[PDB]
Design a protein around this ligand. Structure first.
Ligand SMILES: *CC(=O)[C@H](C[C@@H]1CCNC1=O)NC(=O)[C@H](CC1CCCCC1)NC(=O)[C@@H](NC(=O)OCc1ccccc1)[C@@H](C)OC(C)(C)C
Ligand SMILES: *CC(=O)[C@H](C[C@@H]1CCNC1=O)NC(=O)[C@H](CC1CCCCC1)NC(=O)[C@@H](NC(=O)OCc1ccccc1)[C@@H](C)OC(C)(C)C
Lengths: 306, 306
């Protein structure tokens, strides 16, 4: 029993974090085999951030311009290349702590753990979702760029996020591990803004199932609804449209609790129309949307990693 | 910017988790140097749980009755002893991954990270507080006992919790790493209940300071209050009394934001008396009480560990 915003164990990723210094700029890097991945704006100076041409900035650098430190050990850079907005520093030593891993670009709505890091040293771990507007609501200070987001499946670390910048509303923007930003953002310090966000409907529904699995039924009702009539109310409350795909994904949770997906939708509709009336669900007074259907099954059933 | 319920990086503790099997009972253990710590009820059978005498149960066991597995490696038990409600299995191999560590018994109100584990394999990490009634609101399934709670200071892991049982309200009870339960609970399956809980006042105040550090001021007011007049309203809303000690602890946060502690108390009083009126604080529609003053400073300033 109980339900918490749970992150994956972070040890496999802690063994990969390093410090990268070039010029006056220091940030975090990810050391896998003999390559260190980090944000390309590490080559920018205090006047290079307004509108840089990174190809032209990179051709002017030598390998010895990059200081890479793993613990109290200098790593030696023997090559470099730019891929999109990430820089790849080839070093002469393979990381002995390299886990099994993949690079994956996730869809909005999916969740991951963030290992926040400063100067190559892990600071803390928390769970995030990619919002529909391709920002993440993180917790990041100066010097956190290069920290990564990840999922773990059995023994394999699927890296999905590298942190780059903060936007004026206090939300955060970054790339996949191949240097492609999530969303329309670019790595220069010109005016950019998040864009309007929406609530991740399928996730709110998964979390209502988590509540039922854990003992709450107070929000259920005897009604049902059709997908279209649901989506009509969802649109009004700035919720994402629920697709037939989302319905099928909620299949296992529906079958374990015996509440049909559209019946749970009728419950959400009533919660949206009437509020929660001073009641809470799983310790929350808001409809929570940063648990996927997979997250709920994982935590309400006990899946481990090795 | 941003504020998240952040756990400590869990790698140092993942390297210590093991599986302990005796009879038909399997749970998690903590391997530090050449000792494995685990809950003593691992020696209980399906009819030993009603009212066991553990001393009498333990004298009847031999070393070879205990199967300890670290990864795919059998560890050999060469001795055993009971300390309060924890069993200490001396094994012939020191754990090479033993971090620097301490065993500490924490006060109600303090927070820690929990590495939830099944069969010696980490499942996830989340942040918890010791509630005033000496339970924790965890996320735990069958087979999670022996999972530990911890804090990290620089390089040192301060272990403070080992999980033992769930209580009928869905909250959780366990011991410090020397086998002493938090609260009045005992490790047998007779009727026990949590006892009424209260809100951790000093922590709610620390979290209001986190909100101000991060940009919100909407809940502030021009009023002040005295400690006694505050505590008079706090008592009505089932809040813990705020002591002069709590006031001093909130000193750094008060000085960094320029809001006197008693002025922030006057703000909390108004929030308690009037509710939040459909507004949120740091993404929450409830007054959050599982961040200590230390937690806020750590996350709003960037303290790392190595
Ligand atoms: C890499 C890092 O460690 C930091 C981490 C951020 C600082 C505070 N929280 C963070 O997540 N990243 C930066 O400071 C980053 C620097 C690079 C250098 C140039 C190429 C990309 C950014 N800058 C920002 O995050 C910056 N955001 C920003 O400029 O957004 C575009 C913009 C510009 C003007 C108006 C609107 C939008 C931050 C520091 O600036 C604000 C004011 C948005 C917080
Ligand atoms: C060690 C474990 O892996 C599990 C973990 C719990 C199971 C579900 N969530 C958990 O945190 N621990 C137990 O199952 C534990 C077994 C030991 C064996 C005897 C010595 C101490 C307990 N049992 C419980 O947690 C049990 N709680 C319980 O008996 O509380 C006392 C009580 C008895 C009767 C009435 C009221 C209170 C759970 C499994 O039983 C309830 C119904 C309270 C969930």
């Amino acid at each position: 029993s109980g339900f918490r915003k749970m992150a994956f164990p972070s040890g496999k990723v802690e063994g990969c974090m390093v410090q990268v210094t070039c010029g006056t700029t220091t940030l975090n890097g990810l050391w896998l085999d003999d390559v260190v991945y980090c944000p390309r704006h590490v080559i920018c100076t205090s006047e290079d951030m307004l509108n840089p041409n990174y190809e032209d900035l990179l051709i002017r650098k030598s390998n010895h311009n990059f200081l890479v430190q793993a613990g109290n050990v200098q790593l030696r850079v023997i090559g470099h290349s730019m891929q999109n907005c990430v820089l790849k520093l080839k070093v002469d030593t393979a990381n002995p702590k390299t886990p099994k891993y993949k690079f994956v670009r996730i869809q909005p709505g999916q969740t991951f753990s963030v290992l926040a890091c400063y100067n190559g040293s892990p600071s803390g771990v928390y769970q995030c979702a990619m919002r529909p507007n391709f920002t993440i609501k993180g917790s990041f200070l100066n010097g956190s760029c290069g920290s990564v987001g990840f999922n773990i499946d059995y023994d394999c670390v699927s890296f999905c996020y590298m942190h780059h910048m903060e936007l004026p509303t206090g939300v955060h923007a970054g790339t996949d591990l191949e240097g492609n930003f999530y969303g329309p953002f670019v790595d220069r310090q010109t005016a950019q803004a998040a864009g309007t966000d929406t609530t991740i409907t399928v996730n709110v529904l998964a979390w209502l199932y988590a509540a039922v699995i854990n003992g709450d039924r107070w929000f259920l009702n005897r009604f049902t609804t059709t997908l279209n009539d649901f989506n009509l109310v969802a649109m009004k409350y700035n919720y994402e449209p629920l697709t037939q795909d989302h319905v099928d994904i909620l299949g296992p949770l529906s079958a374990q609790t015996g509440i049909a997906v559209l019946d749970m939708c009728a419950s959400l509709k009533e919660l949206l129309q009437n509020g929660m009336n001073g009641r809470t669900i799983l310790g929350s007074a808001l409809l929570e949307d940063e648990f996927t259907p997979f997250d709920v099954v994982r935590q309400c059933s006990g899946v481990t990693f090795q």
